[PDB]
Every structure is written in C-alpha cells, then in structure tokens.
Write a protein that binds this ligand. Sequence first.
Ligand SMILES: *[C@@H]1O[C@H](CO)[C@@H](O[C@@H]2O[C@H](CO)[C@@H](O[C@@H]3O[C@H](CO[C@H]4O[C@H](CO)[C@@H](O)[C@H](O)[C@@H]4O)[C@@H](O)[C@H](O)[C@@H]3O)[C@H](O)[C@H]2NC(C)=O)[C@H](O)[C@H]1NC(C)=O
Ligand SMILES: *[C@@H]1O[C@H](CO)[C@@H](O[C@@H]2O[C@H](CO)[C@@H](O)[C@H](O)[C@H]2NC(C)=O)[C@H](O)[C@H]1NC(C)=O
Ligand code: 4MA
Ligand code: CA
Ligand code: CA
Ligand code: CA
Ligand code: CU
Ligand code: CU
Ligand code: CU
Ligand code: CU
Length: 496
Amino acid sequence: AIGPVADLTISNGAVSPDGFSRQAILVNDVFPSPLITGNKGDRFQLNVIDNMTNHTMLKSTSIHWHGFFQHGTNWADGPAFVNQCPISTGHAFLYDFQVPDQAGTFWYHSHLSTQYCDGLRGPIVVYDPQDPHKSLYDVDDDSTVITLADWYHLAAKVGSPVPTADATLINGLGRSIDTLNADLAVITVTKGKRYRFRLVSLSCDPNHVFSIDGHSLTVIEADSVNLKPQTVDSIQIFAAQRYSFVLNADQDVGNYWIRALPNSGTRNFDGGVNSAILRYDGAAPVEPTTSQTPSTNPLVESALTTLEGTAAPGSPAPGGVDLALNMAFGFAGGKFTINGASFTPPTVPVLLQILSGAQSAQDLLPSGSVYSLPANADIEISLPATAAAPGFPHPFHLHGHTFAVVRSAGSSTYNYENPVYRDVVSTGSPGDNVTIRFRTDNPGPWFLHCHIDFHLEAGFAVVMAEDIPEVAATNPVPQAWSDLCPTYDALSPDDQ
Ligand SMILES: *[C@@H]1O[C@H](CO)[C@@H](O[C@@H]2O[C@H](CO)[C@@H](O[C@@H]3O[C@H](CO[C@H]4O[C@H](CO)[C@@H](O)[C@H](O)[C@@H]4O)[C@@H](O)[C@H](O)[C@@H]3O)[C@H](O)[C@H]2NC(C)=O)[C@H](O)[C@H]1NC(C)=O
Ligand SMILES: *[C@@H]1O[C@H](CO)[C@@H](O[C@@H]2O[C@H](CO)[C@@H](O)[C@H](O)[C@H]2NC(C)=O)[C@H](O)[C@H]1NC(C)=O
Ligand SMILES: Cc1ccc(C(=O)O)cc1
Ligand SMILES: [Ca+2]
Ligand SMILES: [Ca+2]
Ligand SMILES: [Ca+2]
Ligand SMILES: [Cu+2]
Ligand SMILES: [Cu+2]
Ligand SMILES: [Cu+2]
Ligand SMILES: [Cu+2]
C-alpha cells in the first residue's frame, strides 16, 4: 500500500474492469484506486495532484476521507461547497490531518457531484498495533481488503440521472451479462490459517448481500468501530459501509464462490456475475462449482454492539437529549427534500461562509438546509423511512462523527445501553424509524446525507453547523485552502 504520506495523482484514462472499456478516473495511473494505509495516531499527508482533462467527468476534484473525524481539520474533510472549493485541474492540494483516536477500515472518494462513480474511490486501512481483535487472526494485509463497487458502461453524467449498474466489481473485477468470460477476482487462503478480511463498499447506489459459499464470517468491526464478535453467514452491506470479519480457512481445499448480490441491476449469479473466487492454496486454478445455501444467520444490525459496550449519549428515553431533530424526507420537482428543503451547492463553501462571518443557520446558504448545533451537547436525530423519497432504503452518512444507532431498520426496539456505533446507517423502509445519537465535540460544518450519490446530487442532504462560534478558532486553515476558491471561481465553466 501507499501512505500515510503520499502523492495521489488524479487523471483520466480507459479502464475495462468488467471486460468492456470506457473512459474513467485513474489514481496514480491505476484503476481501481489504490489502497492507502497508516497506523493509529499517524499524520496523513496526502497530496492530491489534479491532472484531469475531461469535463464530462469534471476536471476539478475534491476528496473525502470517509470515517475520519477531522477534529481541527474540517477544511480537509472533502465535500465540495461544504468544506472546500474543488481543486482545479493543473493544481495540487495537500490534505494534512491526524488520526489520533481512530483505527479500522475507511475509504476515500471524490466528493464533487457524482464524480466518485466515474472511478475515484479506494480503500483505506488504519492499523492498530494493539488491536483488541488481533489474536483472532494470522493474516491482515493488502491482500485481505475486499472492495465492492457498482460499475456503469455509461459515465455518471452520460447515462440516466439514476442509472442501474452493469456489473458488480469485487476488488475491481466482475462480469456483466454481456461479458460472461471477463476476469474474476481471486482471494487466496491457506488451509488452517485465519484471516481478517476488511469489506469496503465503494458503491454509488446499490447495497449488496455478501456471502462466501461454505464459510461463516465472524464480524468484528463496523464502519471503523470495534464490535463484540458476531458470527454470521451473510452480510447486507450498504453503500459506504465497512465491516471486518474473521474467516477461518478450515474447509476442504477447493474453490468457493464469493457472492455480492446487489439490490438492483442483475439480481442473480448466472455465468459468474456478482461473484469472485475464494481459492485455497493447492486447489485447481478453476472456477468454483459450489452452491449457495439459504442464509439462516444473516447480520442483524440491532444485534450488534460495540466492543466496549458504550452507552448512547443522553438519557434512556425518546428525546432524552439536549436537542432532538426529526428529518422528514420528501421529493418534489425531481429533487429530494429534507424538512421541505433540497440541498443545492452554494457558490461560497459553507465553511468559508462561517469563516467569513456567518453567525447562524439563517445566515448560511443554502437556506433551509443548515442546522445549527450547540457545543458539548447530546443530539438525537430520527430519520423515519418513507416511500415519499424514492429509491429507499437510503443509507445516511454523518461526517465528523460516529453515532449510536439507538434504533435500527427492521427493528421496533430502542437501545440506549449498548447500541452499535457507526457512520453510515440504512434508514430502512416504511414503518422504520431509524434514530441516531451523537455528542457535539467537533466544531465545524458537517454533511449529513444519503450516500446514494445520485440522491445526493438530487439534493438529499443537510449540513450540521456544529458550534458555529468556535469553528474559526478550532479549524485554522492552510494558505493552500484559502487559495482554492479564487482559483476555482476564475475557471470558465468548461474547465470545471
Ligand atoms: C470523457 O468522458 C466521457 C465519459 O466517460 C466520454 O463519454 C463517452 O463519449 C461518447 C460520445 O462521444 C460515447 O459513445 C456514445 O454512446 C452513446 C450511448 O451508447 C449506448 O446507448 C446507445 C443507445 O441506447 C446504444 O445503442 C449503445 O449500444 C450504448 O449502449 C451512443 O448513442 C453514441 O453513438 C456513442 O457511441 C460513450 O458512451 C462515452 N463513454 C462514457 C463511459 O459514457 C468521452 O469519450 C470522454 N472524452 C475524451 C475525449 O475521451
Ligand atoms: C420517529 O421519531 C421521532 C422522535 O421520537 C418522532 O417525532 C416525535 O414524536 C412525538 C409525537 O409526535 C413528539 O412528542 C415529538 O415532538 C417528536 N420529536 C421530534 C424531535 O420531532 C416521530 O413521530 C417518529 N416518526 C415515525 C413516523 O414514527
Ligand atoms: C425520482 C426517482 C426515481 C427513482 C430513484 C431511485 O433511486 O430508484 C430516485 C429518484
Ligand atoms: Ca484470471
Ligand atoms: Ca492472500
Ligand atoms: Ca476503530
Ligand atoms: Cu463516503
Ligand atoms: Cu464521510
Ligand atoms: Cu438515497
Ligand atoms: Cu458526504
């Protein structure tokens, strides 16, 4: 892997991850984007050098480091027009931040429009030298990162506004229905060894039901949060989520199908679509002939708990917090709404608005989309599922924070004692009332949005303006950040 100090050069080029070729986005001349790693406590210095020339996929860029708290470095978080203006082509920008108090599985992706769908997205691992789960496994390295991704034959701005994927990629490879002989990813294991696999969803839209024929999976991490171990036989993973699971390679030496069934597009495994190969050392170099058995032990989010058994912030009753917010989803004029407002990117990034003197949510643009949060407070947010926002279940993501999921999708119970904490949560289907809690210990504007990128583009977002009075003092910005907007605003539209 590369990192924690590295150049990330962004360019355009042709790729063929499902045996069909198209123009896309390369990072350090490769697709899919390379793995970046560090250790707990490391300073990351990622110099993003933008050499893109294709306006259809956008020449500008901005990168989000998904899951990092960015305390004191809100300017480095990535969302275009929230935390920065985009980097302009022919320029570079250094993201310089620390990860003092976090370890686990993360990822990076463009956070400008729908650009990450065109290929700028890759995994990150922050290792913990004192990982409490470390004695459960033998192997945890580049080879044990498993990414899932949707792939489209037409680019994000070329196809339908809400497209359906032609292929699922596993570690960057997969088959489409018209490319049944395309290359497949192979993950190799040695019989008798134990592996920490780190499963990362780079998806722009679909969720995937992940399973491995003949094997159970011991889940030990969700979205960079250590869990009490939970053995499962399938995992439904939503866009932008991560899980670590331990696999004991104790079955017969052979080839076993790795499966990732999407919730849209091709919903079968015919011809080896939506599949990869688990190969034991010594097995024949052939495709598996294993069968899928019904999942009788699927992952259930409400049954997950943190390793430390951390209580939810606040008191154990509905509304037992300093500020309770309800987000009512809707859809009007082809745009998503939250509490009647659709997010449209402001000309001046929200952070720059605050640093320039905006004092309240009413002062902040876009109007109706920004919520001021008090400092050092317990917050509860409910996000009740509704068919009024098409394309459910919507996996919501809160920047700058992990949150307690006090009520999960598909469950009527509330857990304040020992709920799972994570950073992306499915808000489920009608009848659900997914409810989250967090503490406001991190001054800055933080995006809260559906991580289905096509829905974000259609306005399905709000901004949480946390502790506005302390933002400037807590987040001193580098000169290079100050220069982003004047450079970007000087571009002609066709160079954006
Ligand atoms: C930079 O970025 C872009 C995005 O990657 C590039 O866009 C490509 O540009 C061309 C047009 O110049 C496309 O080819 C066209 O595709 C359409 C649609 O094809 C599909 O749909 C039709 C109708 O349903 C169907 O008949 C076909 O079988 C396809 O399924 C065609 O109608 C056109 O005739 C033409 O073939 C590309 O599809 C497109 N690729 C990306 C992935 O969307 C662009 O080329 C880049 N510019 C630099 C110079 O390379
Ligand atoms: C889901 O969650 C919230 C919070 O429990 C609900 O909104 C609250 O519900 C009651 C009754 O209407 C009120 O006492 C409060 O004023 C509400 N608090 C929030 C901050 O507005 C809501 O009713 C639920 N929605 C789904 C449909 O069950
Ligand atoms: C309007 C509309 C329709 C469908 C979707 C979707 O994601 O399926 C999103 C928006
Ligand atoms: Ca091969
Ligand atoms: Ca291996
Ligand atoms: Ca962690
Ligand atoms: Cu993300
Ligand atoms: Cu994020
Ligand atoms: Cu959505
Ligand atoms: Cu985001």
